[PDB]
Amino acid sequence: VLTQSPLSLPVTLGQPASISCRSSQSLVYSDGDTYLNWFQQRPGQSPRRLIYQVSNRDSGVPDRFSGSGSGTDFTLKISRVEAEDVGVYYCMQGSHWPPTFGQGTKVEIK
Amino acid sequence: TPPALNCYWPLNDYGFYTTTGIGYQPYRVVVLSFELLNAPATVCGPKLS
Amino acid sequence: ATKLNDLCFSNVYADSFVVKGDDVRQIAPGQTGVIADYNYKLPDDFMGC
Amino acid sequence: AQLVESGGALVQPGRSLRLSCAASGFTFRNYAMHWVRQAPATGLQWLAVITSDGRNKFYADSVKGRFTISREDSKNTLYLQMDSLRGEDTAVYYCVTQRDNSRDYFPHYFHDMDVWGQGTTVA
């Protein structure tokens, strides 16, 4: 079970933003790693991964996306939110089967 | 003449992965060595005369 | 391998098993895999052969 | 790695629906396949996985015993057989897999889930 906050993030274009995710249990797996990923789903599109293993970014992901966290408390950070960054940001854990997602944070540009 | 018996190549490759342990990750190494004032200095620090 | 006779140890432990050819590669330090992780693991340290 | 879902439709509660998902851009046989569904009710909900060899099939308790996951390697196609559908099962069903199969064994195929299809609506 993952809970995200805020449910909706009102960020002025060009300004930074962050999305919080809080787990009901430590997401540290048996091998010592942490399988907490972040995805963004743009309206009209399926989810895409941006950040994985808490702070790593996928190839093709803009350097403005980063993250940090441990245990139960994780954060997705965007150095500046652009118009194209509109969408719902989900946190996902694969540490404990079944894998779960947060409710998602709707980030909108003001 | 390889692969005849007891022919070996002296070199081997590093299998560097993005998914392995720290001890098995690649590192870039730079080693600095100074020539201690034999010939007239060519490099000095940010000092005034 | 050529200096083994000249190396003195307190003792040696010989671990015996049958493994699939392709999975032989997992019998090493710094490895992951079905065998390396769930059947037989080696420490990331010096070993014999 | 592209996934294309199909088979979405409106089906009365109690009846069954079978989904499919065509794979391209990668070797289907070399990856585990998952179904995930999306609804306001659950956000993104993982349902089931079938391993690359088609041998091990794991299901979430919420669908365990009602849904069956299967694959046809010869057609590069993933399927989902959903029986006794309820109103609560209304969702967009996504075909999901991974690009990285370095650790193709339990539970590592739940760690990335980085390949998603467009999703198909089931009502």
mmCIF file of C-alpha atoms in Angstrom:
data_model
loop_
_atom_site.group_PDB
_atom_site.id
_atom_site.type_symbol
_atom_site.label_atom_id
_atom_site.label_comp_id
_atom_site.label_asym_id
_atom_site.label_seq_id
_atom_site.Cartn_x
_atom_site.Cartn_y
_atom_site.Cartn_z
ATOM 1 C CA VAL A 1 0.000 0.000 0.000
ATOM 2 C CA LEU A 2 1.378 3.354 -1.140
ATOM 3 C CA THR A 3 -0.048 6.800 -0.368
ATOM 4 C CA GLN A 4 0.900 9.907 -2.323
ATOM 5 C CA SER A 5 0.680 13.594 -1.437
ATOM 6 C CA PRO A 6 -0.552 16.081 -2.528
ATOM 7 C CA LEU A 7 -3.387 14.522 -4.504
ATOM 8 C CA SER A 8 -3.134 17.502 -6.870
ATOM 9 C CA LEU A 9 -0.130 19.778 -7.355
ATOM 10 C CA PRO A 10 -0.830 23.405 -8.634
ATOM 11 C CA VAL A 11 2.602 24.456 -9.935
ATOM 12 C CA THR A 12 3.249 27.634 -11.912
ATOM 13 C CA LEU A 13 4.947 27.023 -15.255
ATOM 14 C CA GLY A 14 8.734 27.055 -14.890
ATOM 15 C CA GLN A 15 8.615 26.491 -11.129
ATOM 16 C CA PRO A 16 9.892 23.378 -9.238
ATOM 17 C CA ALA A 17 7.653 20.711 -7.745
ATOM 18 C CA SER A 18 7.877 17.535 -5.712
ATOM 19 C CA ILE A 19 5.620 14.544 -5.139
ATOM 20 C CA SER A 20 5.660 12.538 -1.917
ATOM 21 C CA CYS A 21 5.015 8.815 -1.544
ATOM 22 C CA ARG A 22 4.632 7.020 1.770
ATOM 23 C CA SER A 23 4.530 3.260 2.185
ATOM 24 C CA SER A 24 2.743 1.250 4.861
ATOM 25 C CA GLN A 25 5.916 -0.848 5.159
ATOM 26 C CA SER A 26 9.624 -0.530 4.458
ATOM 27 C CA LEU A 27 10.272 -1.059 0.771
ATOM 28 C CA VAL A 28 13.755 -2.382 1.330
ATOM 29 C CA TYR A 29 13.895 -5.804 -0.265
ATOM 30 C CA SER A 30 15.722 -8.953 0.853
ATOM 31 C CA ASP A 31 18.794 -8.050 -1.213
ATOM 32 C CA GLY A 32 19.096 -4.653 0.476
ATOM 33 C CA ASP A 33 17.862 -2.692 -2.542
ATOM 34 C CA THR A 34 14.689 -0.613 -2.733
ATOM 35 C CA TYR A 35 12.269 -1.185 -5.562
ATOM 36 C CA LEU A 36 10.406 2.109 -5.501
ATOM 37 C CA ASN A 37 9.777 3.531 -8.970
ATOM 38 C CA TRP A 38 7.985 6.605 -10.310
ATOM 39 C CA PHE A 39 5.792 6.745 -13.407
ATOM 40 C CA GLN A 40 4.029 9.556 -15.212
ATOM 41 C CA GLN A 41 0.819 9.065 -17.107
ATOM 42 C CA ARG A 42 -0.049 11.839 -19.528
ATOM 43 C CA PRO A 43 -3.761 12.234 -20.451
ATOM 44 C CA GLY A 44 -4.576 10.162 -23.531
ATOM 45 C CA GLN A 45 -1.482 8.024 -22.899
ATOM 46 C CA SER A 46 -0.395 4.994 -20.878
ATOM 47 C CA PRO A 47 2.051 5.269 -17.886
ATOM 48 C CA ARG A 48 5.785 5.708 -18.513
ATOM 49 C CA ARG A 49 8.628 5.281 -16.056
ATOM 50 C CA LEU A 50 10.751 8.284 -15.170
ATOM 51 C CA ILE A 51 12.622 7.324 -12.021
ATOM 52 C CA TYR A 52 13.571 3.899 -10.738
ATOM 53 C CA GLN A 53 15.289 2.484 -7.703
ATOM 54 C CA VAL A 54 14.380 5.712 -5.877
ATOM 55 C CA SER A 55 16.719 8.092 -7.751
ATOM 56 C CA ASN A 56 17.868 6.692 -11.140
ATOM 57 C CA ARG A 57 16.356 7.965 -14.361
ATOM 58 C CA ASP A 58 15.580 6.083 -17.542
ATOM 59 C CA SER A 59 17.334 6.884 -20.768
ATOM 60 C CA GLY A 60 15.380 9.557 -22.623
ATOM 61 C CA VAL A 61 14.176 11.124 -19.367
ATOM 62 C CA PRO A 62 15.055 14.859 -19.012
ATOM 63 C CA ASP A 63 17.704 15.716 -16.418
ATOM 64 C CA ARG A 64 15.138 17.886 -14.650
ATOM 65 C CA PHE A 65 13.729 14.674 -13.149
ATOM 66 C CA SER A 66 15.369 13.221 -10.037
ATOM 67 C CA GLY A 67 14.466 11.683 -6.692
ATOM 68 C CA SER A 68 15.492 10.419 -3.268
ATOM 69 C CA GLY A 69 14.219 8.466 -0.271
ATOM 70 C CA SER A 70 14.526 5.379 1.911
ATOM 71 C CA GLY A 71 12.553 3.034 4.138
ATOM 72 C CA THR A 72 8.948 4.144 3.713
ATOM 73 C CA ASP A 73 9.461 7.777 2.727
ATOM 74 C CA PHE A 74 10.192 8.687 -0.894
ATOM 75 C CA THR A 75 10.108 11.862 -3.006
ATOM 76 C CA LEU A 76 10.008 12.583 -6.744
ATOM 77 C CA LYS A 77 11.517 15.923 -7.654
ATOM 78 C CA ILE A 78 11.184 18.104 -10.734
ATOM 79 C CA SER A 79 13.634 21.029 -10.904
ATOM 80 C CA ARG A 80 11.159 22.950 -13.094
ATOM 81 C CA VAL A 81 7.722 21.858 -14.266
ATOM 82 C CA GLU A 82 7.029 22.441 -17.949
ATOM 83 C CA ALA A 83 3.752 22.382 -19.879
ATOM 84 C CA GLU A 84 4.629 18.925 -21.186
ATOM 85 C CA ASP A 85 5.006 17.645 -17.628
ATOM 86 C CA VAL A 86 1.255 17.705 -17.059
ATOM 87 C CA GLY A 87 0.007 14.316 -15.913
ATOM 88 C CA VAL A 88 -0.442 11.939 -13.018
ATOM 89 C CA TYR A 89 2.662 10.819 -11.183
ATOM 90 C CA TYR A 90 2.501 7.394 -9.581
ATOM 91 C CA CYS A 91 4.816 5.688 -7.165
ATOM 92 C CA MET A 92 5.219 1.921 -7.516
ATOM 93 C CA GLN A 93 6.721 -0.701 -5.267
ATOM 94 C CA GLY A 94 7.909 -4.107 -6.440
ATOM 95 C CA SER A 95 9.598 -5.026 -3.157
ATOM 96 C CA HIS A 96 6.587 -6.827 -1.710
ATOM 97 C CA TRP A 97 4.359 -9.048 -3.822
ATOM 98 C CA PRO A 98 1.768 -8.238 -5.136
ATOM 99 C CA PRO A 99 3.379 -5.055 -6.503
ATOM 100 C CA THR A 100 1.394 -1.915 -5.761
ATOM 101 C CA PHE A 101 0.918 1.645 -6.935
ATOM 102 C CA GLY A 102 -0.027 4.841 -5.137
ATOM 103 C CA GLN A 103 -3.228 6.669 -6.055
ATOM 104 C CA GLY A 104 -1.220 9.040 -8.251
ATOM 105 C CA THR A 105 -0.571 12.782 -8.029
ATOM 106 C CA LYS A 106 -2.073 15.052 -10.622
ATOM 107 C CA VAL A 107 0.426 17.716 -11.508
ATOM 108 C CA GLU A 108 -0.964 20.676 -13.375
ATOM 109 C CA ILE A 109 0.575 23.835 -14.715
ATOM 110 C CA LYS A 110 -0.610 27.249 -13.567
ATOM 111 C CA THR B 1 49.351 -21.109 -31.506
ATOM 112 C CA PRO B 2 45.834 -20.957 -29.996
ATOM 113 C CA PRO B 3 43.696 -22.844 -29.289
ATOM 114 C CA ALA B 4 46.481 -25.439 -29.028
ATOM 115 C CA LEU B 5 47.133 -26.958 -25.634
ATOM 116 C CA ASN B 6 48.484 -24.446 -23.102
ATOM 117 C CA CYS B 7 48.015 -21.420 -25.370
ATOM 118 C CA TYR B 8 46.527 -18.546 -23.379
ATOM 119 C CA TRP B 9 45.701 -14.932 -24.028
ATOM 120 C CA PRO B 10 47.339 -12.692 -21.349
ATOM 121 C CA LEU B 11 44.485 -10.193 -21.520
ATOM 122 C CA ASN B 12 40.895 -10.420 -20.317
ATOM 123 C CA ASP B 13 37.789 -8.230 -20.475
ATOM 124 C CA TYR B 14 35.836 -6.424 -17.765
ATOM 125 C CA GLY B 15 32.126 -7.242 -17.804
ATOM 126 C CA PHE B 16 30.873 -3.886 -16.533
ATOM 127 C CA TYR B 17 27.124 -3.888 -15.822
ATOM 128 C CA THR B 18 24.738 -1.208 -14.570
ATOM 129 C CA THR B 19 23.029 -3.809 -12.413
ATOM 130 C CA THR B 20 25.934 -5.262 -10.402
ATOM 131 C CA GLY B 21 27.639 -4.718 -7.039
ATOM 132 C CA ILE B 22 29.755 -1.648 -6.342
ATOM 133 C CA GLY B 23 32.990 -3.617 -6.273
ATOM 134 C CA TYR B 24 32.230 -4.755 -9.822
ATOM 135 C CA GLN B 25 31.306 -1.350 -11.194
ATOM 136 C CA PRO B 26 33.785 0.584 -13.395
ATOM 137 C CA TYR B 27 35.854 3.441 -12.037
ATOM 138 C CA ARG B 28 37.869 6.072 -13.839
ATOM 139 C CA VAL B 29 41.281 6.547 -12.347
ATOM 140 C CA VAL B 30 43.629 9.481 -12.684
ATOM 141 C CA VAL B 31 47.055 9.379 -11.115
ATOM 142 C CA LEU B 32 48.960 12.610 -10.701
ATOM 143 C CA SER B 33 52.740 12.644 -10.471
ATOM 144 C CA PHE B 34 54.929 15.636 -9.851
ATOM 145 C CA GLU B 35 58.469 16.379 -10.907
ATOM 146 C CA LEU B 36 59.944 17.863 -7.759
ATOM 147 C CA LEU B 37 61.761 21.031 -8.860
ATOM 148 C CA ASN B 38 64.644 19.666 -10.956
ATOM 149 C CA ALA B 39 64.237 21.879 -13.999
ATOM 150 C CA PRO B 40 62.891 25.457 -13.593
ATOM 151 C CA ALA B 41 59.231 25.396 -12.564
ATOM 152 C CA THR B 42 56.583 25.339 -15.269
ATOM 153 C CA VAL B 43 53.604 25.009 -12.950
ATOM 154 C CA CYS B 44 52.893 26.937 -9.763
ATOM 155 C CA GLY B 45 49.911 27.675 -7.563
ATOM 156 C CA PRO B 46 47.793 30.874 -7.461
ATOM 157 C CA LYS B 47 50.333 33.031 -5.652
ATOM 158 C CA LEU B 48 51.497 36.628 -5.887
ATOM 159 C CA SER B 49 55.086 37.818 -6.141
ATOM 160 C CA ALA C 1 47.044 -21.682 -10.807
ATOM 161 C CA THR C 2 50.759 -22.410 -11.224
ATOM 162 C CA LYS C 3 51.652 -21.339 -7.685
ATOM 163 C CA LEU C 4 49.046 -23.397 -5.870
ATOM 164 C CA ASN C 5 51.591 -25.796 -4.399
ATOM 165 C CA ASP C 6 53.507 -22.901 -2.855
ATOM 166 C CA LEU C 7 50.492 -21.542 -1.010
ATOM 167 C CA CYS C 8 49.981 -22.764 2.522
ATOM 168 C CA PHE C 9 46.539 -22.834 4.065
ATOM 169 C CA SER C 10 44.985 -23.923 7.333
ATOM 170 C CA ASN C 11 42.656 -26.057 5.284
ATOM 171 C CA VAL C 12 40.641 -26.326 2.087
ATOM 172 C CA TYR C 13 36.975 -27.075 1.652
ATOM 173 C CA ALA C 14 35.834 -28.810 -1.512
ATOM 174 C CA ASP C 15 32.213 -28.187 -2.443
ATOM 175 C CA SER C 16 30.808 -30.848 -4.794
ATOM 176 C CA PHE C 17 27.725 -30.629 -7.064
ATOM 177 C CA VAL C 18 26.240 -31.126 -10.570
ATOM 178 C CA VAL C 19 25.166 -28.013 -12.425
ATOM 179 C CA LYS C 20 23.917 -27.267 -15.936
ATOM 180 C CA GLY C 21 26.700 -26.202 -18.324
ATOM 181 C CA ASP C 22 25.215 -22.766 -18.998
ATOM 182 C CA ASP C 23 24.840 -22.199 -15.245
ATOM 183 C CA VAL C 24 28.507 -22.960 -14.594
ATOM 184 C CA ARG C 25 29.176 -19.276 -15.206
ATOM 185 C CA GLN C 26 27.207 -18.534 -12.015
ATOM 186 C CA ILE C 27 29.810 -20.314 -9.908
ATOM 187 C CA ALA C 28 31.800 -17.172 -9.244
ATOM 188 C CA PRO C 29 31.969 -14.069 -6.971
ATOM 189 C CA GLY C 30 29.941 -10.993 -7.951
ATOM 190 C CA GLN C 31 27.249 -13.070 -9.635
ATOM 191 C CA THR C 32 23.477 -13.154 -9.696
ATOM 192 C CA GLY C 33 21.121 -15.792 -11.038
ATOM 193 C CA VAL C 34 18.945 -18.743 -10.170
ATOM 194 C CA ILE C 35 21.910 -20.685 -8.845
ATOM 195 C CA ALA C 36 24.053 -17.833 -7.614
ATOM 196 C CA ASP C 37 21.158 -16.483 -5.554
ATOM 197 C CA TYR C 38 19.006 -19.482 -4.542
ATOM 198 C CA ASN C 39 21.147 -22.640 -4.809
ATOM 199 C CA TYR C 40 24.781 -21.858 -4.214
ATOM 200 C CA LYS C 41 26.475 -18.564 -3.510
ATOM 201 C CA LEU C 42 30.106 -17.618 -3.224
ATOM 202 C CA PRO C 43 31.391 -14.652 -1.143
ATOM 203 C CA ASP C 44 32.991 -11.793 -2.942
ATOM 204 C CA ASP C 45 36.496 -12.664 -1.797
ATOM 205 C CA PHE C 46 39.584 -14.650 -2.773
ATOM 206 C CA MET C 47 39.074 -18.357 -3.417
ATOM 207 C CA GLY C 48 40.946 -21.352 -4.637
ATOM 208 C CA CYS C 49 39.971 -22.703 -7.995
ATOM 209 C CA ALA D 1 9.323 -2.638 -26.895
ATOM 210 C CA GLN D 2 5.733 -2.159 -28.045
ATOM 211 C CA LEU D 3 2.597 -3.735 -26.600
ATOM 212 C CA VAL D 4 -0.807 -3.580 -28.305
ATOM 213 C CA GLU D 5 -3.951 -4.519 -26.373
ATOM 214 C CA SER D 6 -7.250 -5.633 -27.870
ATOM 215 C CA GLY D 7 -10.485 -7.438 -26.941
ATOM 216 C CA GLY D 8 -12.017 -4.688 -24.800
ATOM 217 C CA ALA D 9 -15.822 -4.651 -24.812
ATOM 218 C CA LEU D 10 -18.958 -4.139 -22.737
ATOM 219 C CA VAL D 11 -19.986 -7.395 -21.089
ATOM 220 C CA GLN D 12 -22.864 -7.944 -18.679
ATOM 221 C CA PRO D 13 -21.878 -8.997 -15.106
ATOM 222 C CA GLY D 14 -21.574 -12.760 -14.722
ATOM 223 C CA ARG D 15 -20.305 -13.211 -18.277
ATOM 224 C CA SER D 16 -16.730 -13.610 -19.503
ATOM 225 C CA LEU D 17 -14.325 -11.583 -21.638
ATOM 226 C CA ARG D 18 -10.965 -12.526 -23.106
ATOM 227 C CA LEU D 19 -8.245 -9.968 -23.785
ATOM 228 C CA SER D 20 -5.186 -10.192 -25.965
ATOM 229 C CA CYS D 21 -1.952 -8.244 -26.351
ATOM 230 C CA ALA D 22 0.390 -8.377 -29.322
ATOM 231 C CA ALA D 23 4.087 -7.823 -28.740
ATOM 232 C CA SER D 24 6.636 -6.341 -31.111
ATOM 233 C CA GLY D 25 10.075 -4.706 -31.014
ATOM 234 C CA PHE D 26 11.434 -7.436 -28.733
ATOM 235 C CA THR D 27 11.456 -11.201 -28.274
ATOM 236 C CA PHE D 28 8.197 -12.079 -26.519
ATOM 237 C CA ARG D 29 9.528 -15.469 -25.388
ATOM 238 C CA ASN D 30 12.364 -13.875 -23.404
ATOM 239 C CA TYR D 31 10.181 -11.852 -21.038
ATOM 240 C CA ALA D 32 7.542 -12.355 -18.355
ATOM 241 C CA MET D 33 4.160 -10.807 -19.087
ATOM 242 C CA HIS D 34 1.790 -8.941 -16.779
ATOM 243 C CA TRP D 35 -1.705 -7.525 -16.738
ATOM 244 C CA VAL D 36 -2.446 -4.294 -14.885
ATOM 245 C CA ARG D 37 -5.776 -2.493 -14.879
ATOM 246 C CA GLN D 38 -6.653 1.141 -14.361
ATOM 247 C CA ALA D 39 -9.727 2.615 -12.753
ATOM 248 C CA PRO D 40 -10.579 5.607 -10.491
ATOM 249 C CA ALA D 41 -11.526 2.900 -7.983
ATOM 250 C CA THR D 42 -8.011 1.441 -7.734
ATOM 251 C CA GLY D 43 -5.682 3.706 -9.674
ATOM 252 C CA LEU D 44 -3.162 1.281 -11.165
ATOM 253 C CA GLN D 45 -3.771 -2.291 -10.009
ATOM 254 C CA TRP D 46 -1.529 -5.247 -10.788
ATOM 255 C CA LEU D 47 -3.502 -8.387 -11.537
ATOM 256 C CA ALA D 48 -1.408 -11.277 -12.775
ATOM 257 C CA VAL D 49 1.885 -12.446 -14.241
ATOM 258 C CA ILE D 50 2.908 -15.307 -16.439
ATOM 259 C CA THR D 51 6.585 -16.187 -16.589
ATOM 260 C CA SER D 52 8.629 -16.415 -19.786
ATOM 261 C CA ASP D 53 8.322 -20.190 -19.968
ATOM 262 C CA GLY D 54 4.561 -19.951 -19.425
ATOM 263 C CA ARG D 55 4.937 -22.221 -16.409
ATOM 264 C CA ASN D 56 4.379 -20.063 -13.328
ATOM 265 C CA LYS D 57 1.227 -17.979 -13.070
ATOM 266 C CA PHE D 58 0.667 -15.683 -10.114
ATOM 267 C CA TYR D 59 -2.524 -13.795 -9.303
ATOM 268 C CA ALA D 60 -3.576 -10.986 -6.996
ATOM 269 C CA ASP D 61 -6.094 -12.131 -4.374
ATOM 270 C CA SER D 62 -8.679 -9.753 -5.878
ATOM 271 C CA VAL D 63 -8.744 -11.822 -9.103
ATOM 272 C CA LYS D 64 -7.223 -15.079 -7.911
ATOM 273 C CA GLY D 65 -9.514 -17.865 -9.095
ATOM 274 C CA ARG D 66 -11.574 -15.629 -11.388
ATOM 275 C CA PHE D 67 -8.984 -14.510 -13.924
ATOM 276 C CA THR D 68 -6.539 -16.703 -15.862
ATOM 277 C CA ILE D 69 -3.356 -15.438 -17.512
ATOM 278 C CA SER D 70 -1.903 -17.216 -20.542
ATOM 279 C CA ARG D 71 0.436 -16.666 -23.479
ATOM 280 C CA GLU D 72 1.016 -17.868 -27.028
ATOM 281 C CA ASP D 73 4.707 -17.540 -27.801
ATOM 282 C CA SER D 74 4.098 -18.599 -31.397
ATOM 283 C CA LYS D 75 1.947 -15.491 -31.899
ATOM 284 C CA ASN D 76 3.905 -13.171 -29.604
ATOM 285 C CA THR D 77 0.603 -12.642 -27.827
ATOM 286 C CA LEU D 78 -0.434 -12.291 -24.195
ATOM 287 C CA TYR D 79 -3.979 -13.186 -23.125
ATOM 288 C CA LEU D 80 -6.264 -12.675 -20.133
ATOM 289 C CA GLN D 81 -9.334 -14.813 -19.526
ATOM 290 C CA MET D 82 -11.730 -13.073 -17.176
ATOM 291 C CA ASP D 83 -14.669 -15.105 -15.946
ATOM 292 C CA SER D 84 -17.683 -14.089 -13.860
ATOM 293 C CA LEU D 85 -17.024 -10.396 -14.482
ATOM 294 C CA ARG D 86 -18.426 -7.925 -11.987
ATOM 295 C CA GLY D 87 -19.280 -4.225 -12.296
ATOM 296 C CA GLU D 88 -16.210 -3.604 -10.106
ATOM 297 C CA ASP D 89 -13.984 -5.035 -12.850
ATOM 298 C CA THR D 90 -14.600 -2.019 -15.074
ATOM 299 C CA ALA D 91 -11.122 -0.742 -15.950
ATOM 300 C CA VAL D 92 -8.571 -0.094 -18.666
ATOM 301 C CA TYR D 93 -6.493 -3.213 -19.046
ATOM 302 C CA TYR D 94 -2.845 -2.694 -19.798
ATOM 303 C CA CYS D 95 -0.375 -5.118 -21.211
ATOM 304 C CA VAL D 96 2.854 -4.772 -19.257
ATOM 305 C CA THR D 97 6.367 -6.246 -19.508
ATOM 306 C CA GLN D 98 10.001 -5.321 -18.970
ATOM 307 C CA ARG D 99 12.946 -4.317 -21.124
ATOM 308 C CA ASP D 100 15.542 -5.696 -18.713
ATOM 309 C CA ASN D 101 15.465 -9.472 -18.167
ATOM 310 C CA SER D 102 18.876 -9.737 -16.475
ATOM 311 C CA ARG D 103 17.241 -11.444 -13.508
ATOM 312 C CA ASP D 104 14.506 -13.499 -15.124
ATOM 313 C CA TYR D 105 13.174 -15.099 -11.947
ATOM 314 C CA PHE D 106 10.890 -14.439 -8.995
ATOM 315 C CA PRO D 107 10.290 -11.674 -7.877
ATOM 316 C CA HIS D 108 12.535 -9.634 -10.089
ATOM 317 C CA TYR D 109 10.069 -9.349 -12.918
ATOM 318 C CA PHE D 110 7.964 -7.072 -10.714
ATOM 319 C CA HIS D 111 10.783 -4.609 -10.137
ATOM 320 C CA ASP D 112 10.804 -2.506 -13.315
ATOM 321 C CA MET D 113 7.499 -2.924 -15.203
ATOM 322 C CA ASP D 114 8.800 -0.317 -17.665
ATOM 323 C CA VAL D 115 6.982 -1.445 -20.838
ATOM 324 C CA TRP D 116 3.330 -0.462 -21.178
ATOM 325 C CA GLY D 117 0.789 -0.743 -23.982
ATOM 326 C CA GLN D 118 -1.949 1.778 -24.819
ATOM 327 C CA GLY D 119 -4.528 -0.115 -22.737
ATOM 328 C CA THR D 120 -7.983 -1.417 -23.677
ATOM 329 C CA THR D 121 -11.268 -0.663 -21.929
ATOM 330 C CA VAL D 122 -13.263 -3.447 -20.322
ATOM 331 C CA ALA D 123 -16.726 -2.662 -18.999
#
